[PDB]
């Protein structure tokens, strides 16, 4: 039923549980001692673990897409935030891997319909409005308890920091099926960053970690999907440059000084080729160490797989760094009429959809 | 002043575009040159496990995917 992602069946199953509620004999103190009982490698603990594994799919079938039944799926979810701490400290590698999935599903269902991944708002105030290259202050109120999700984000980056030494283990140790057990450890945890829209600098650090994880020697079914997950994670960084560039350009343009006095780079015919050769000196030989990013794209190309075309597309896009951002200046689009402008944009989108259908 | 801003935008775009166009061509060539010269990050590929087959293998795979894949933009 869960696989269907098929709503009616999910509702029926949810209604159906009420009667038995269990199959074995049974919680915070009982779980840690059961974790200690699970520390005994043999037999009853194995049975308990199997039941728990099935149970997450119990959340997983429950967590297909439904927000109404997710409210009915709720008590388990409050328990799950608390459990989620148990997913970290337990060392339940095969176990708490499902515990991460459930938590993510619950949080996502619980809040903010917008699904904040892509920043469409490229404009700003009538002035530059405090050119702020250190800190971004976009909405601040899309989540009511933004720190409530940020508390999960506080649990998020520590779990993301848990992948950090794991790069020295998932990479320093080779890829194995036990490593594929740990491969489930990050197996969807980066997907939580996809709904994650609370901050940006940490994302840059995470991208660096992914490249680091990628290299040392020379398939991974979920591992390529793990790379396929991280390849989606690379796409979010492409928005940042454009936003920063747009803001800087606008600020420079606005002031009364606007007569050709703007020669600044966003990251001489021979002088361009000299800068090309100088960039080629940087090439053949967010302003960190860029060589790893280039290498990562090449490495992905070497890796292959059926999702490889998506990876290749990302590499070409990454190679360009400002060119479409100039073309993005044309795609940008009054404080009073800006709502009507927003309304018009929505209407226009509907019209465009209709035109596409036609 | 909006019209002036748009114009300023156009002029900026042209300069960025001339310089940008040259830069883009150079970047592509290097990447093109790099592919011809696929050895930069392939020091690990030259350390071991990399063949330096490059662009030809990539091109074949890419071509098949693109043809059967989505829009070839």
In short:
This is part of a larger assembly, with 2 copies of chain A. The first copy, chain A, is mainly alpha-helical and 358 residues long.
Overview of the molecule:
The structure is cut from a larger assembly and holds two copies of chain A. Helices cover 65% and strands 0% of the residues of chain A. Chain A has helices at 7-16, 28-39, 44-62, 68-72, 74-89, 93-110, 146-170, 177-183, 191-195, 201-214, 221-254, 269-284, 291-302, 308-319, 323-330, 338-357. At the A-B interface, α11, α12, α13, α14 and α15 of A face α1 and α3 of B. The PDB classes it as membrane protein. Keywords: inositol 1, 4, 5-trisphosphate receptor, calcium release channel, neuronal type 1, membrane protein. The entry is titled "Structure of full-length IP3R1 channel in the Apo-state".
Largest interface: A-B, 39 and 39 residues
Number of DSSP helices of chain A? 16
The assigned structural class of chain A equals: mainly alpha
Work out the helicity level of chain A: 55-70%
Order of helices and strands of chain A: HHHHHHHHHHHHHHHH
Number of strands of chain A: 0
Family (chain A): Belongs to the InsP3 receptor family.
Subcellular location (chain A): Endoplasmic reticulum membrane; Cytoplasmic vesicle, Secretory vesicle membrane; Cytoplasm, Perinuclear region
Protein name (chain A): Inositol 1,4,5-trisphosphate-gated calcium channel ITPR1
Organism (chain A): Rattus norvegicus
Blueprint (SSEs and pairs):
This is part of a larger assembly, with two copies of chain A.
Chain A: H1 7-16, H2 28-39, H3 44-62, H4 68-72, H5 74-89, H6 93-110, H7 146-170, H8 177-183, H9 191-195, H10 201-214, H11 221-254, H12 269-284, H13 291-302, H14 308-319, H15 323-330, H16 338-357
């Amino acid at each position: 039923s869960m696989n269907k992602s098929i709503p009616v069946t999910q509702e029926l199953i949810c209604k159906a549980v009420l009667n038995p509620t269990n199959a074995d004999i049974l919680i915070r103190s009982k779980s840690v001692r059961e974790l200690a009982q699970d520390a005994k490698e043999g037999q009853k603990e194995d049975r308990d673990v199997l039941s728990y594994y099935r149970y997450q799919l119990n959340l997983f079938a429950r967590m297909c897409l439904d927000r109404q039944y997710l409210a009915i799926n709720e008590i388990s979810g409050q328990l799950d935030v608390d459990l989620i701490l148990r997913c970290m400290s337990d060392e339940n590698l095969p176990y708490d891997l499902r515990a991460s999935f459930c938590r993510l599903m619950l949080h996502m269902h619980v809040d903010r319909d917008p699904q904040e991944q892509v920043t469409p708002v490229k404009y700003a105030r009538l002035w530059s409005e405090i050119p702020s290259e250190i800190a971004i202050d976009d909405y601040d109120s899309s989540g009511a308890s933004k720190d409530e999700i940020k508390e999960r984000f506080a649990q998020t980056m520590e779990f993301v920091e848990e992948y950090l030494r794991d790069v020295v283990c998932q990479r320093f140790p080779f890829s194995d099926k036990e490593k594929n057990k740990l491969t489930f450890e990050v197996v969807n945890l980066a997907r939580n960053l996809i709904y994650f829209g609370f901050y940006n600098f940490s994302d840059l650090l995470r991208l660096t970690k992914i490249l680091l994880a990628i290299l040392d020697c020379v398939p991974e079914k979920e591992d390529i999907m793990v790379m396929d997950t991280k390849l989606k994670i690379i796409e979010i960084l492409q928005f940042i440059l454009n936003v920063r560039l747009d803001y800087r350009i606008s600020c420079l343009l606005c002031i009364f000084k606007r007569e050709f006095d703007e020669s600044n780079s966003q990251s001489p015919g021979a002088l361009d080729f000299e800068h090309i050769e100088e960039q080629a000196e940087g090439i053949f030989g967010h302003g960190g160490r860029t060589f790893l990013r280039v290498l990562l794209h090449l490495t992905m190309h070497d890796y292959p797989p059926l999702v490889s075309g998506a990876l290749q597309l990302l590499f070409r896009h990454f190679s360009q760094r400002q060119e479409v951002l100039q073309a993005f200046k044309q795609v940008q689009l009054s404080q009073d009429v800006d709502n009507y402008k927003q309304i018009k944009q929505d209407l226009d989108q509907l019209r465009s959809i209709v035109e596409k259908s036609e | 002043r909006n019209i002036i801003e748009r114009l300023q935008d156009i002029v900026s775009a042209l300069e960025d575009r001339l310089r940008p166009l040259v830069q883009a061509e150079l970047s592509v060539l290097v990447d093109v040159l790099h592919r011809p010269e696929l050895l930069f990050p392939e020091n690990t590929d030259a350390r071991r496990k990399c063949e330096s087959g490059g662009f030809i293998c990539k091109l074949i795979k890419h071509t098949k995917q693109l043809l059967e894949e989505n829009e070839e933009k």
